Symmetry: C3
Subunit: 258 residues, 3 copies
Amino acid sequence: SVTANIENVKKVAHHIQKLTSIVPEIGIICGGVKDKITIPYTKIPNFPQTSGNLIFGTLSGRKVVVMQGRFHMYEGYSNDTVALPIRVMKLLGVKILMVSNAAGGLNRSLKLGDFVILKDHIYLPGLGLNNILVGPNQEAFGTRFPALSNAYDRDLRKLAVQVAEENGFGNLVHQGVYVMNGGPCYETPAECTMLLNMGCDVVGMSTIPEVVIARHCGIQVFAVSLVTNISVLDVEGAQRAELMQSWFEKIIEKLPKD
Amino acid sequence: SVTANIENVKKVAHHIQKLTSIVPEIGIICGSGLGKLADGVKDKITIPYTKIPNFPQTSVVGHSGNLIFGTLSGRKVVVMQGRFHMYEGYSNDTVALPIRVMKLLGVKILMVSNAAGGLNRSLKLGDFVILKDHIYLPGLGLNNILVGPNQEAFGTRFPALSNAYDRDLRKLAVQVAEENGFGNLVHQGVYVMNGGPCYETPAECTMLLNMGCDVVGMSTIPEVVIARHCGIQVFAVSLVTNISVLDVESDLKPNHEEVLATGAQRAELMQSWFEKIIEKLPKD
Amino acid sequence: SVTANIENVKKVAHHIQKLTSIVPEIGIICGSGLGGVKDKITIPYTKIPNFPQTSSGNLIFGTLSGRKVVVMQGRFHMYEGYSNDTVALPIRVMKLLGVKILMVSNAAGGLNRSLKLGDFVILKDHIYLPGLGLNNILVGPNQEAFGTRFPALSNAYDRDLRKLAVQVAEENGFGNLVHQGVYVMNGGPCYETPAECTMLLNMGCDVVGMSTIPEVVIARHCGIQVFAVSLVTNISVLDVESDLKPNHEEVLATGAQRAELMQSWFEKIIEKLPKD
Ligand SMILES: Nc1nc2c(ncn2[C@@H]2O[C@H](CO)[C@@H](O)[C@H]2O)c(=O)[nH]1
Ligand SMILES: Nc1nc2c(ncn2[C@@H]2O[C@H](CO)[C@@H](O)[C@H]2O)c(=O)[nH]1
């Protein structure tokens, strides 16, 4: 709807900056914060509309902005719509984006409730000409052809694992390749088999577009899938929510800080 | 086009119900090989798409597709004569609307045929590949027919495609084929949709075959998705209208004429098969 | 964007034919490694009504290796947001202008592990990921004046042109740089992730790029013979642990470094094309 260029994103971010003094260093999109300011999307002009909230505050002694209310491609949201919040985070000061999502577990060693830290992704829609970055490149935010090298910051993944390991739930944590199915259908057994064989570990309908935008504008990304279902290969969340929440809090606690 | 939402679909459904007393229990999407089936419907009421306000318009070189009501083996059917292929540029709503209309009309089972290239090397020209599953390549991209606000009136936001190709219908179809002595023509496999309208390159065919795809076509899955989304049971058969070329060195090439020819040649048998499956469908 | 139908294409072709009497038999789409034509007129896209606009881009007519050529300087990439019609029109204009053979280069990532930087990979086939996923440039009403509703893509990359290309490279001392392979299109504009590259490699892809296939599909649709070469402007990184990453500036540098060789090759290829 509203082109996610520097002028429009600057407008939304400037507005939000009147609504709050909190300069978030960490962006959090969830698939508890202290001294919080809850800004409903409805309150934000030219900001995408789900009802969703942008929660600012402090988490493990860090300034965070939480996105409550997500914009999925399968809902029909445009590239710009989905990009805009992430680029706003950029202008607001977000240096690190932490994302959780629900995913089907393709990898046969995954179990319900497992955490699969994304170490890489296969952006099926992206490969198929539905990349969120298709269209004029917004040069203010990033380069025309972003590399997705170390897209899922290895250091953040290392830290997340350590945090999980140190807190006794290291057994739950895997790292894997997330493949995006544009959705909104769940994957057929044939699709899951194909996806597994493509070297995919978990499959979901979200996240990648945000990650691409985040990486495009230089926001480090941390992303974890919660395996909320085990993919069926042949045709013949609430639980782990507070664990994952605790995990995100603890990781943030140990995030480096300027 | 017009949104395949409940209001518009009701309008269309109601328009249709003014034009026929036939409450279809079975919807049939005339793909390759079914042209003759359409013609065999007893006591037809033929409703050109052009006579249905807000119904999607499609033509065969100028001639409007038709909705065909009547019976087939003693069962009330609506035959879609004229499908809306995504490669023609039809919208998700256009493709979805007729299936959702079928839902409101009383369709419980959707039978669809299509023409497909045989990726699976054991397939022969003229084989019937009952779809037991599919790989919705456009769907995996961001071109799933359900992309956009979900029409809650018709189904859930995230439909599972578990048993999309009803195993019981598949079993029945196989049994009917077996009983009638053409079981040997009958296979089951995975259909992968290539948005098209280009036939697959050999590299694409090799890739698709390695993905576990048995047949490849440009249709059907979106209809199936819409069908499943609204709880219509689906039976789908691919007619192997060509053997996919996996080798770039080959001089053989897919051409629609031969596809039509295989459809024409197998149409009688497929009609018979469908008619006989229909007669054995459970209940009434 | 104007529909790439016969009427609109004709109009464009005609306005162009006002600006030049060079009837091109060879269309060249410059990608990496291209960018010599003699007796040339440079027609900026800006001077051509309804012709797509890109940065201006030029339609260059003239003589190359004795043959009438039209060189498309300024390409239309799907990742830029260009429509099918926009990408198709110029190829269809070429067709009307008289083009028989389309020679196209591009920059691509080297997936095939035997590939080296600056290698040439003649496309012998492709995987049109956007095309499989309903983003085929031909989606929409078929333009019957140009081609059939369901084009086959067999011999899409003319085996004879490929043979000639390889022979020309061989005898001109650089056959060692020349491979043939499968090109996969990534809609882009992101470079592939390591997981994507690994998947693409495993799909049987040798090189990956964000271009070419749409034009090739349109060229084949209207019966233009196609020769296409990927310059391996970067070795795809399959390892997520690796520090190595693609870099457009390096991609550009590699292309330019090979441009002269690519030019020579294309020229010597055009040199050996059958003259009727
Ligand atoms: N993709 C693909 N579609 C086919 C093939 N054979 C028949 N078809 C179908 O039949 C028409 C083209 O012949 C299209 O509508 C396709 O859905 C094939 O080999 N590959
Ligand atoms: N998809 C893809 N395109 C590349 C690669 N290297 C060079 N290119 C091409 O060069 C430009 C970006 O470098 C795009 O237009 C691509 O088509 C690569 O590794 N992957």
